[PDB]
Structure formats: C-alpha cells, structure tokens
Design a binder for this molecule. Sequence first.
Ligand SMILES: [Mg+2]
Ligand SMILES: [Zn+2]
Lengths: 26, 718, 63, 83, 237, 225, 694
Amino acid sequence: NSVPGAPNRVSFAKLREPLEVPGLLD
Amino acid sequence: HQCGLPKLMALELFKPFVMKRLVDLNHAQNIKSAKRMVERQRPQVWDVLEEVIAEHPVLLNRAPTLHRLGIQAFEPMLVEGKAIQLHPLVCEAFNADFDGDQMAVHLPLSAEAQAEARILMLSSNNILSPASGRPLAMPRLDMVTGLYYLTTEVPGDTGEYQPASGDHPETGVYSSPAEAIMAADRGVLSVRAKIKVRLTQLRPPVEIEAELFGHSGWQPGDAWMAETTLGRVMFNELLPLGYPFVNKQMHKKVQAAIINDLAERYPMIVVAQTVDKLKDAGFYWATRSGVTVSMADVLVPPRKKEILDHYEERADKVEKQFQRGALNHDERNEALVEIWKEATDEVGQALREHYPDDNPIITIVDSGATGNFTQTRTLAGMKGLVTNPKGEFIPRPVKSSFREGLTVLEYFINTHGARKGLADTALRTADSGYLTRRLVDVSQDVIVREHDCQTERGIVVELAERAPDGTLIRDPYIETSAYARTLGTDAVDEAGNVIVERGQDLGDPEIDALLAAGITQVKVRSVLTCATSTGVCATCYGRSMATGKLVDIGEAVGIVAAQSIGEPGTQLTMRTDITGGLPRVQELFEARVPRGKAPIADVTGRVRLEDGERFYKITIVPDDGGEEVVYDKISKRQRLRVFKRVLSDGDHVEVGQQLMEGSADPHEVLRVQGPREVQIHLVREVQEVYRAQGVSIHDKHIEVIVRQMLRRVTIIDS
Amino acid sequence: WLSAASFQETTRVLTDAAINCRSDKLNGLKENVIIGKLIPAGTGINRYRNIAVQPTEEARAAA
Amino acid sequence: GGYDTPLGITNPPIDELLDRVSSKYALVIYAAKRARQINDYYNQLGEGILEYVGPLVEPGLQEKPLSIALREIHADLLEHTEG
Amino acid sequence: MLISQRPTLSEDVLTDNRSQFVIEPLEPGFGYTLGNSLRRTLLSSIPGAAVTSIRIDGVLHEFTTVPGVKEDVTEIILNLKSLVVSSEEDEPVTMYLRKQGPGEVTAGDIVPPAGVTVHNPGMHIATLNDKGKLEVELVVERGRGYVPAVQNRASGAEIGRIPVDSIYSPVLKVTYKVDATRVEQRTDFDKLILDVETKNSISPRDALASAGKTLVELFGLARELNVEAEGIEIGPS
Amino acid sequence: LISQRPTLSEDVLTDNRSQFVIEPLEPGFGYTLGNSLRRTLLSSIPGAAVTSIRIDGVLHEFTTVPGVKEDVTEIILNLKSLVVSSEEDEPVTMYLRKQGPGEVTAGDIVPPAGVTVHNPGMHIATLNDKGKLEVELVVERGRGYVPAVQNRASGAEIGRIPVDSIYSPVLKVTYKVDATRVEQRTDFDKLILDVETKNSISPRDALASAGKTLVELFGLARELN
Amino acid sequence: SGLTHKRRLSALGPGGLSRERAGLEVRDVHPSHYGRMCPIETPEGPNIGLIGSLSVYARVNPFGFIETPYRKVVDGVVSDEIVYLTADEEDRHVVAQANSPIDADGRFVEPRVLVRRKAGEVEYVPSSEVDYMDVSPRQMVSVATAMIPFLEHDDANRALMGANMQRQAVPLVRSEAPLVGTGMELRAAIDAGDVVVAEESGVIEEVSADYITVMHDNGTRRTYRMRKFARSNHGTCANQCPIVDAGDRVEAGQVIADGPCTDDGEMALGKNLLVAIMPWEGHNYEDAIILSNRLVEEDVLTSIHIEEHEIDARDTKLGAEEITRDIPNISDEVLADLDERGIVRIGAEVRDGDILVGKVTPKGETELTPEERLLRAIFGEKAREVRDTSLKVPHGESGKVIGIRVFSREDEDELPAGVNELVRVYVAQKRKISDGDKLAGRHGNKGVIGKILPVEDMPFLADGTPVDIILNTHGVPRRMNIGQILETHLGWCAHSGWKVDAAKGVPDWAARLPDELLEAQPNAIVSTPVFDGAQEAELQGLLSCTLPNRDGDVLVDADGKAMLFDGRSGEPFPYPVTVGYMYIMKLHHLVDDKIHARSTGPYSMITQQPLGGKAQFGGQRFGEMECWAMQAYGAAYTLQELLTIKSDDTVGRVKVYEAIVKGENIPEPGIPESFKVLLKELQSLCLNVEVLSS
Ligand SMILES: [Mg+2]
Ligand SMILES: [Zn+2]
C-alpha cells in the first residue's frame, strides 16, 4: 500500500507502523 | 597425486613445448606458423597438448604459504571449464575451502626441477604434518560422517543375530560377506546390524589369531568366524591385506590412529592408496546417511523456562540487595556473572540430555567431523553472556537461542563481540606473519651437517611420574617430549640389565618397554647440547616428523621449526595484567621482561613476608649466614604464589622459587639458576600457550629456536 | 651484512658495515637467494650435487 | 610390498626407489643427471657415436627421459658415487 | 539418429571364476544406465540350484551340537550353504550323505540322484571323531536370486526340518564403477568397468551373456509398442 | 522358480500422459528397470527444435524492433518454448509475417509441408500500429540439448542469430513399485511408470523409442557367444 | 549497489584517520549507534569498522549530527508525536522498545517496560518512567540488511556477509522476485532510481520497447525513453522494460518501466530454486555447490556483460596516425569484417585477437637486416614506411559488436589536444552459468559451483520433479545461519500454497496470524519483516497444512522433509531430505574474469622482472613465504630456476626458450639483474661494494 500499483505481498508482521520510511537519497 | 588443469591455462603455460611438438609432427612448417596455430587454437593443438602434458608435474600454491605443505606438486590432467580441480584430501594442508579461493600454478622446466617436484614434493609423498607427525591427508567432515555411519552398530536393527533356540536355529549367521551383501541388497539385513560372518580374506585380531591359529600364520584363506556388523567388514576391506581386523566405530580419533599405524608400518604408496579408498567409501556412505537440518531437528529443551525462572529469582535477589545498598556496583556484577554462568551450564546439560543419539546435529558434532557443543548450545538453548567492546561480560545475558530468534536488544548487544572477533582475526594474521619472519631470520643457519657429533651430553625428559599408591601414571605430554628422540644413555632397572640401549629412536614399543620395566627418566640427545661446530647433526635432532625416519644430512631444520611454530598463529586467543596468547609468545621469544613480572628467589633460606603500606615487601634470610636479599617495590595487585597453599611468613624457599604470582623473567633464571634452567623455562612456557588451544608441536622445534638465543657470552673483563 | 641489511634497519646496518669494512662469505641461506646461486641445503650441497652417474658394466655391454 | 598397480607419476614406487640411494636428495640428483644424459644422447644421435649411452631399458611411445631414468634406477642398471 | 561410436567389450581374466569387463565408449550418462541394470540382472536373473532345508538325525529340539562330530550345527549349516550344486528337474529332490567311523566328510561323500551334480567334491563338511555317525538329508531345488529361510510350512508334519538360506545365484559378487574417456575431442564419454565373480557352476562370460539376453527381452517389451519408432541405431559390428 | 513372464500394459490418463505397468518382476528389480527407462526417456528421445532465426530489421540479438513491445532477446526467450515436430532430415525454414496492431502468436507461423506447430496459442510478441514483425526460423532434427552454434563455425551471414536448441519431447517421468513380500517367499515387484510428453509425441512412442535404444545397447553384451 | 554507495559513512579520507594508523577502538560498535549507523553492514576486509551505512530512519542535522525519530510518550500513553533526537538528548532521556505491548490507545499493558538508559544500560523501569519509544523494530538496521528475511536467527558474521554479498549480484536476463521477502524490496527499488516512475497521472497512449508516452489529464503528453542495453560502470547490462499496456491508466508515482534487477517494480536480485539439504557424493564438499542442467538449458542464471574498447589516432613527431583498412602485411582473411574505414561491422562476431579498429602509425627510417632485405628482394615486397598498431580483442574475450561511437576533430567534437579521432567499440556477450562461478543466498551462504549434473541424475521427488541445487549439511550448524533453513521451509509453503482449517474455529497457533494469511494460492508472494515476522509456531502450522500438487499428493511432510529417489541407481534415499525453495543469486566473481596464465610476456623497465596483473599478461608472485617453503623442502634447483631464468636473468630467459623449442637441455643460470641494480645503488650511495674472487 501507499505505492499506487504495487503487487500484493501479504505480510506476517504484527505491529502497526507510525512513521513511513523517508526518502533514501535525502 | 592428480590435479585438474583447465585446458586454456595449460595451453598458455606449455606453449613452447607444444610449438616444438607441432613442428615435429609436421602439423606446422616452422615455429612461426606453429605459434600462429597455438594463438588461433586450431583443432590439432589439443591432441598435441595431451601428449606434452603427460607426466610433467606442476606446483600448486595457495597464499599465504604458512608452512611447507602450502606448495605441493601434482600430475595434471586436462579438464574443460575454467577452474582447477583440487583433491578433497589436500585442503587441510593448503587451508582451502571452495567459497571463492584461488590457487597459483607454476611450471618446473629443467630436469633437476622436475625431479624435485616429482620426488621431494609430490602430494602423496607428504601425508604427515612436519610439526607433530599427525596425518594431514586424512578423511574429514563428510568422509568422517560416512565412515562413522557405516561402522556404528545399532541394536535391534534389521536382520540381527538372534541366538534363538527351542523352535529354530540362530538365523543371523552368514557364510561370506558376499552372502551378507546379497541379503542387504534385498531388504533383509542392515549394514549396521550385528551378525556373525565367516571371514577368510581378513586377518583376525591378535587375541583371536593367537587362540585359533598356531605359532604364526593366519595365512589368507583360513576361515574364522567374526561377530561384527557388515559395515565393519566393508570398512576393513579397504585397509591393507595384512592389517588385523579392527571392529571399532570410526570416530575421527580412531581413523587418525589407524592412519598413523599404517604410516609407521607400511610403505608410502600403501598409505596413499588406502586413504583414497577411505575417501571413496566415506563420500558414498555420507550421502546414504540421512544427515539434514530441518527446524524439527533443532529440538528445544523442555525445562528451559523452569531453569531460567529459577536463576532469574537469584539475579533479582542480588539486584534488590544492591538497591538496598548492601553491596557495591562491581561485586553486584560479579554475582550476576557467576549466576548466569551456572545457568548457561545447566541449560547446556539439559539440552545434551534431551537430544537423542541419532540426531543429525549431535551426530555431526559427536563423530568428530566438525563443530563443538557450545555452537549446538547457542543454536538450541541459550547464547549466554556476551562481552563488551572492552572485553568484560555484560551482566544481562542473551536468553534466546538462534532457533527462537534474538530480540532487537539482544541482537544489538551480540554484534559488539562479533565485530571485535572479526577485527582481531585480521590483526592476528598480520602478527603471526611477523613472528614467523623473525623466527626464520634467527634460525636459518641451523641445517643438518653431520650424522653424529658423538657427544655424551643430553637432556633429561620427564616420562611418567610415579603415584603414591604405586603405579606409573603416564605423562600427558609424552608424544611431544620423549617420542622421536635418540637415547643418550643405556636405560637400566636397579642397575640391572639394559632395556633400551644408547642410540635408539624411542618409539611406542620402547616407551612401553621402559614403563613396563619401571623407568621414570631417560636422558635423550637434544639440539640444545649438540657438539657440532656449524649446524646440527642428525642423531641429536632425531626423527623427522614428516617421514618417520632419521633426518637427512642436508635438511633445513630451522626453516621447518620456524614454520611449525608460526603457522599456529590466528588460533591463539588471549582468554574468554598477564599476556596470554600470541602476545605472550612474542615476548618469550624476544626475551623481554614481562608485563606482570614476578620475582624469583636468589638463595635458599627463610622468608620475611612484610606487609607494608597496602602492598608487600619480601626479604629472604639465607641459610648460609650471608646477607639478606630484599625485593622492595611489590604492588599488591599481584597475589602471592601458591604451592601444594599460599606463601606465608617464616617459610623456607629454594633457589629458583617464584615468590609472587605472574611471569618470571628469563634473564634472571639464567643468572640465578643457569643455562639449563632457562632452556627448561623457555620451552615449557611457550608450550603452555599452545597446549591451551590444543595445538601439537614437538619440543625439538622450540629447542631449535631457543638454542639460537644462547649462542653468545658477554665480556666482563677484557 | 647482506642478510642483516635485508632483515630490517637497512640504513643502520649498511652504515657500520662500511665503517668496519666488513666482508661477506656468502655462507647463508638468504645470501645465496639474493645473489642467485644454490642454497647450501637440500640437494644443493656438495655431497648430493656432485653425484657421478654411469651405467654399470653388465648393463652397458649387454645392450 | 603388496599394492595395486601404481599409475602415472607414482610408478616406479618411491619406497622401492629409495632402497637404491641414501636420501631423497641423492635420488633427485641421480635421476636428474641420468635424464640429462638421455636427452644428450637423443640430440647428438644425428652425428656419430659419442660418450653418452642409453636408454638401457626399452622406452615407451613418447616417454620422458625422467621416466626412463627412474625405471633404469629401479631395474638396477646404473651406479652412482656421492661427493 | 545414429550413435557417435559403437561401444566395445573386453574381458580381463583375473582368476578361474572372476573377470573384469570394460564397455567403452558409451554415450554420456549411459554408464549409469547400463551398470545398475546389468548388476541387478547378473545377481538376480540367472537360475541355479541350492540346498533348501536339511534334517540331521539325532537333532530334534536342541539345535546346538551333534552327537559325535566335532563341528556344531551352525558350522555344518554354513558348510552346506556354500555347496555349489546344479539340478535339472524343477521339483524338490532329496539327497543323502552317510559316513561311519572316524575320518573326514567331504562333499564327495554324498551320492546324488540322476540330474543333480555336485561341483566341488573336495569341500570339507564335517569331521567325524571317535566312531560317530552322520546322516543328513539335503533338499535341493531351483530358483534365482537369494531367498532367505522360508519357515516351516508343514510345522506339525516335518518336525525335524532345519530350513537354510538359499543362494540360487550362480554369480556371487558384482561391482561396477563408471569413469570418463575423452572429454576433449569427444566431449565427456563414459566407460563402465564391471567386475564379476561367480561360483564354478558357470563362467562369468556365460553369466554376462545370460544377463544380456534377459535384458534384451525385458526392454523388447517396451520396444514392441510402436515398432516403427525412431530410436538410436548402433550400426554393424 | 516362477514361470510367469513380465507383460507391459497401458492406462491412458490425458492426451499427453499415460501409465505403463510392468509385472511380475524379480524382487528388487522394479527400481532399476524404471530408472533405466526414465534415464533413457529424459535424455535420448529425438525430436525437432528451432535452430536459428533471422529478423529482417535487426543485426544482432541485443537490439529492438521498431513497434514491437519486446526486445529481441525477449522474443528469443519466448520462442524457446515453441514445440514443433518436423519430418525432413535437412533443415527447413518457416516464416512469420504480421503487420499492424495485434498480438503475434505461434499460430501465425506458416510452416512448410512436413513440420507442424503444436501450440498455436503461445505468445511471441505484441505490436502496435507502427510495428511489423518479419522473422524466418530454421527447424532441424536431433536429440538432447545443443547450445548455439556460432556464426564463424557455420560461416553464416551477419543477420543470422543462432539459438539454443532443446530437442527433447519428454516433460516429466516418474515411477513407483509395489513389492508384495509374502511369508512363503513368493515375492515379486510391479513397476508403474508414468510418462508425460509435450504434445509432440505420444507417451507410447516415447517409450518405444527408449526401448529401441536400450535393446540396441544391450545387444552388445548379448552377442558375446 | 547504487543506493548503498550513497548513504555510506566512511571514516577515512583527506581529513580523517588512516587505515593502518587507526586504532581498534574506532572500529567498534558503540551504543550510540542505535538508530544512526548499522552494526551489521560493514566491509570484511581491512576496512571493518571504518566504513559504515546510514540506518533507515536516520536524518542529518544542520550541524552534521545524525538524528533518529522517537515517539513521545506522556503519562504512560504512547502518543503520535515524532521527535528527532540526536545522541546527547537520547542520553538525557529513557527510551522504550518498539515491540512492548500497547492497550489500543497508547497505554502500556505491562507494569514495567524494558528500556535503554544513559550509558547503554538496559533495565526494567516502571511504565511512567518512560518518555520515548522507537518508531519501529528494524530502526537500527540499514537498507541492505533489512532485506535479509529471518535475520534474527542468523549470527552477526553471516548477516554481515549476506548484506555485503547482496550488492554484488549481477542482473540476469529475466529477473523474477522472491517468494519470501521482507517488505523493503519495493521502496529500495523505487528509491534507487533504475525504475521509471510516472511523474503525473494519465493514460498510456502508446508503448514500444523504446518509449512510453502517457497522455496526461489536461491535453499534454510526455514520452519516456528507455535505456536499452547500456553498459553500467562495472560491465553489466542496464536494460529497461515497460510493464504497462497500451490503454492502461497510470497514477503518479506508479512504476511504469522496470530496471536491471527489478520485477514488477520491486528489487529482484536472484531466482527461486528448489533445494535439497543433503550431501551428495563429495561434489558439494566444503562449500561447493551442485546445479541442475535445467538452469543452463532454460537460461535461468544467464547474464549479459558488455565491454568497451577505445583507441585514438593522434599526431606524432613523424606524421599523423590514421585509421584505415590498408594495414601492413596481414592476410585478407583478417580483413573480412572491417567496413571501408577500418572499423568492425555491427553484428560481427569477434574472437580473441581479431582486428577491431585498423590503425597505422608513421615509422620513419630504420636499418633492415641482410636476411630481411634478402627476403624482401625474393618476394618483392616493399619497405612499408608505416607501422601497424591496431586495436585488437584482448586475450580470453569474445562477443558480438553491438555499437560503435566515433568522434572526430574535423566535426568539432571536443577531443584533447593532439587527438584527431577517437573510436569506441562495444562487445557484448551472454554468459551461461558454469562451474567456478559463485552463487549466494541472503544469509551468508556463498560457494562456487563444482558440478553441473544432467537432469536425469539429480535427486527427484515422487512427482518426478528434479531438484535444482544441492547444498551441504555440514556447512549449516557450525555457522549459525538457520535463517536459510527457515527460509527454505517458508519458500516451500509459498510455492505450494496452503489453507488453514478454520472449521472448528481458528487453531491456537494461528491466533495471531493476520487474516488472509489463513489461505494462499500457489506461488504466493509473502513478506516476513526483519525483527517482526513469522514465528516458528506459524511455520510449523503452515507446513502441516499445505496444498497437494495435481493428484492428492502432499510431497513434503509436516517436518519439511521429502522422500527422494537417486537419479543414478534409482533406489530411494533411505531417510527424508529437507527440500524447499531458496532464493539464490549469482555473484560477480565469475571464472572468465579470474583465470590467467603466462609463458612469456611484458617485462619491467628498471629491474627486468615480469609485470603483474591479468590486464597485462602478468606473472604470479613468488614471495618470501614461498621461498621459505622451497628451502624447507630442500629444493635448491627449483628455487634457483624460479629466481633466475624465470624472472631476472635477461640473457638466460632467451636461451631457455630456445632450448625448449629446439629440444635441448635447459642451460645454466647467471646473475639476476636485480642484484646488479642493487650494486649500482649501493655504489651511488658512496659505498665501495666489490665482488672478490678467492
Ligand atoms: Mg575461502
Ligand atoms: Zn650432535
């Protein structure tokens, strides 16, 4: 999610993420 | 004795030989067109290259060359593809695995250089390690799993020997191993089930041979009945024909003892053919063995929560006692570290009791193939205490196994020790290289020049000190002290008849004869006491550890000694202010005054353990009525020496007695006690570093170095 | 001097080998490597290097 | 000596070659000097007969003079004296 | 298609009943195709005869010792289990051996009926001491392979019987290893090295011929589904 | 001693899969027989495959055709999965022409007399209004896997593109045996072999070709004497 | 590799510490690196600790200090304020852990919370003593480390190796995405920038292999060119492939074309292969690897590598060099692929030694030998006052010529002074996988290929399916990287699919499973994040419920182990073997770059020893430790011949070559030339070194 056409990769994760990953070339 | 050489590398190495042969076979008119044929890779070139490569050895080298078995000569055969194919038995010599390593190939040209590569450094002529004589071209890891699986015996297995009576006979008895192999091809027998075979082409062991057959003479073809498993018969058919039947389960120690016996008693060609047969059978039965890892094989102990709760209460008790103020910060850390060391041991013991004997993890560790049990404990179990960036333990342990998965904070704490280990491995490799360079430079002029200097000097070796109850407990380090040495005096019992006379090699039969006759000490020839003006003689050095016979009269025994000492760097760690690892070896060989220097006594007498202002001062009053000897500035960081109990005031001491606890310096042992007692001190103190890591060097490689430190005298009057 | 100058402290070794006017008999294992002749060990010693090989009398005349 | 037939560079067997000499070093120079004499025989073969003789054993198809020299050592067709 | 080169076959006789065959140059991968099939067919397809069961008189409920002779029951059984014999009629037949007085019992001491021949008459069986008596009835029938001890089918009718394992196979031990020939100008062909050891009932050449015959008809089963289906031709000799 | 001889029968599952049951075998022989048949089926059954192609605008494999969506290496990978059954021993050529918008499938290849294309729905390339694909493909017989025979070896032109050839018409072979093991030692085996092919031959013809190869090879041990 | 070269913090350089003079204390991991530098990803050479990588969430101050974000918690209630704290302010406060339980509004569930105190202390404080919290687990890791699934089951050495080998993988020709991944692969692929991303939403108007033109929502359009078959800085290929159809509606930020190592927009560095974890006949002994021949026939692990060769024709003292077909005396065989200006044709196959650009330089006047003059007088050839110096394909290389780029002085291209023409030729070749090549997985398990077996002698399932790679058992437990085994188990479950039987309620092991992980279709893509992923209870349950193949045949049992057959003998292997799907990738350590050999080639200038390197012909070095091994063996003649007539004896090198070619005995050595150079340097330092006779 949050990327408009991403493939559906179902996650085993249990925790909610409050903060999204930044730009990685900032 | 073979290597696989890629054909595109061989065509470039052997280019003038193939140009000559192309001209000789009239494939080319002259050297110019023959060179063009080789450059453009015509189809005649490969037919010629087989001919010119046949029986011309190459030298293969893997860098860094730590000892001399890092260059070996092999007889090449051409392979397709672009990789060299190394025999799986020479990887321990070269220290090579196949994760991306590279080797160098060199070509000997002249007749002398080809003869040296073929005779001196062929790979099947160098089985034994020149440092201890242990076999290096031995089965390892998969060839150990396969032979251990083949030769283990499983009770209750298929088609076992029943002793049954009352209604039918025994039905486990086979008339030949051919019949047993046919029954195992059907689903009727296991290779690890205990049967009774009738063997005719395998020699019985000594007790069975003595009972059944006469004054001598098993004489192949004479039948005897064995009580063993079929896999043990299949293992013993790979050994030589006259080798007696073993009937044991093949741990790596058992296989190494067998190969040592073969190398002592049989020729070199027999030993090389036998280890190739063991290579083949080990690999086959390793893939038919059933060793895998799944997550259901990594069992977890069912009492781990109970154990860790029981020790969590004790740690909580110590922390609340710190919170009340009863004990300080550092003693609380010491209490916590002892609590969690006990918890780690109890978790490992409960794990070892839980796992069955045929688990793959347990089998790979227990067969001596690879690994140790602390890795099994951290994988299933508990990682335990981990260190700091300094090196001290952290009083919170890692209570998760890697099967469970570490937490975020446990993983971050564990990375400190992991990275410090990797950086220290790099630095240790550089330091071991520097030490080997210095040892080569000091002892390069010790070569064997003679056969016998005929001296009557020697050293006394220790050889099984005597128990008070009355028996001879064998010395634990007697393979590196008294084997492979020439006797210097006739060894008698109660001044009676001689047992081993002067000039004998002191092998296993001689050491057994001496201990049966009850002799605790012998005097052996050594290179410390050699009378030869330049170099050493061959009788004083003794047996070459790599060939098993007396050393030749041109050998560079000092280069061999320097590489034998300096190759077991990189596995010499300090511990888990006394130096203790490779920095300890680099300061015994450089004759420095040590870091934690402890004084030694100067004269026999009684002591004055004066306790000064917060630290000691020791005075010795001699029994000769001479003046007192005073050791003034002694800090109380170092504790007093314990022997049999601590040194107390008003006690009697000997001339070389070490007063405090620490490292005595070698310069004062030489002044006080003499040149013999600094050779005993320096050889024993170097070997204590190596023996703590389980490394075997013979003593004669350290006495080649130590002899070169005591070559000189200092002038006190012109 | 030639094997001590190549060990370490080359400048200090060469500056008092010259003052003492030292001479080097090339006996060692390292000085024979530098100047390019046979090391005095192994097969490079006179016992082994000067082996004289010939056919025996029976095998010479019967072939 | 009971073994399978040695193949390639391990024929003739080394523990039988070393009964003929005093050390591996002596065997190296012994075989090397005889190999040089065989090579000189093959090269001065076009002209008249000179001081170098042999092979005293029957050589193979394209066999190297080191292999011929080691077989003549093993079959006791040579002699040497050390210096 | 057509095969690259025709494979050959060359024996190398080691002892009287032992050989070592080499089949080369096979196509890449046909060493393992040919080798295991040839080995299992040699060890399991050729018929032969063997001793099925014995009855030693005086031994009915104590299978430990025989009154009179030096060996015990398991040593006599292992001696008779390695007796190479060949029979013609497929029915189970019975033989007898009797020897009285002291002396040695060999395998020439048993009189066989018509059709059954004993092939090692010099084989030791028992030693008769102090004027004993040995009377054994052997039962010999035919079969293939190695079949184990079939139990007492008529348990209440034959109470003195002792069933033994039957080695019906005339060939005793086969091994093979496959190697490489000519990887360079031929691209990694194969070479299969069989190693047959038989009894003296047949020779290893006849063992390999009978194995090749039965394998030819066993794969002709699959060949006779579409007889005009293109395989790999091997060419004339 | 059993006198019953082994027989082979067939059960047909789908159009390109069947099962063959061989019984009664000697006890221990089913696995060996089935693996001899399987090792011959997966390696030595002769078929046909595309050997080289030539697209008219292009010169090498590492380029693009104007208008088509896949580049030339991707078209090569799409043509690697084309199942084609030929009949002539010499190399034959078949052509593929498409104009304008649309999807080029493998049913647009027009083959000569002798060769058929066995999956006319395989996707090759996709085109827009400005695209035109024109490619000729060379079909040859053989067996096994042979890699791309280079142009300097064949002396071919610059536009020609050699292509890896996979001639085997067999997809996936397995087996299973059912040993009986009765108490009275009258045991046998029963091998049930499963053969699945890729629409170019039937499994009966694949098994007959494997049986023919094995009969020719084991005649050599038979004709000793 | 590109994204991790940026976000790199190197401690060495002009103005910072050296490598040899750096202590062992600056190479450590400090408790203030939490959230700022990764403890795992660092080089393993002699740079360990002196080069690191930025963590995922870290920022950099105006002053140059690294910050990391925290959630402000007040009165035991974790709010959604994000505060960026540098290491000093973090030392002043007390910071919780991101996986401590939360009562659905922010309030902590447990009474005491595990925290991180001022000096790296980890304690248990009351729940109102806490005043910050991490935003996520995997806050401490970097980008390349957050792509290792099941990282917390691997030891830190093997995780360091896995993260460092992940950026050596080569782009393959097809590039599929992993079955079991973490969630990092999408954002690391969009943020690296080799993917083409739609800048503004629209509808795709026309797609080709060269461009995509989208028409925006207000009239205007925009075309995006693709980079087809472009050489990267390290020789690999940089293809870009569209993944949109011709009427598709795209959104802003949507991936519109793929890249080198991506599949459908997410980073895809390897392939999913079926593995068996047995030993097999010694061919995978000590980290070697056995592969199927299916991976060579079906081009699974095949990659394209491009080389670039350059020549230039500049002005000399005696004239100007020129590029021409009219080269000196070479045959018309070797002038066949050259067009009529002396350059190769595009599409032409080149071998080692073939002419690429035909150049010739003016030579001048020299004195020819009497033998050469007599040969010229016999055959009638002329002097040819120009000397051939062309550009040829170097040793061991081949490929197809795919592109030529020629610059000229007369066409006003900016060339350096003197150069009149510059020609670049691009030679691309497609490399199959062959033994000697190095593969890896994401958990530090590298190894060269030892054998490539045929398909029919490979262990196969009861289906008839061969395995694709065989890995050895003895290399797993002494290295403590059972993340590879748990990845193999999850990969089998993602290949085959599953269905949890929630008939009598959800089973107890699946109580914390997210919904719609309660069933999956075949070839599902799943994601286990780094420190918050699938537990072992969940892997046990998913192994026990998994779908059949085509018949009702569950091939891999509840332990993850299958029954295999031997491909050669045909008999079944006697115990079950662990099988599954591991994601392996092919590393840029191939054999065709590593192999070199030399008989005689270039020599140095002052001392006359061979040059070094594969780029030359280049000799191998025979150093001090090798000399000590030769002296320890006793090999005086081998050592002497290596140190004189194979390096330095300049008049002995030629006689050795002449004696080999004429078939004579190798001659005696002489003085090496390095000793004479030493004597002249000692003499020029005013020392009277002299050699004496007797
Ligand atoms: Mg390595
Ligand atoms: Zn002496």
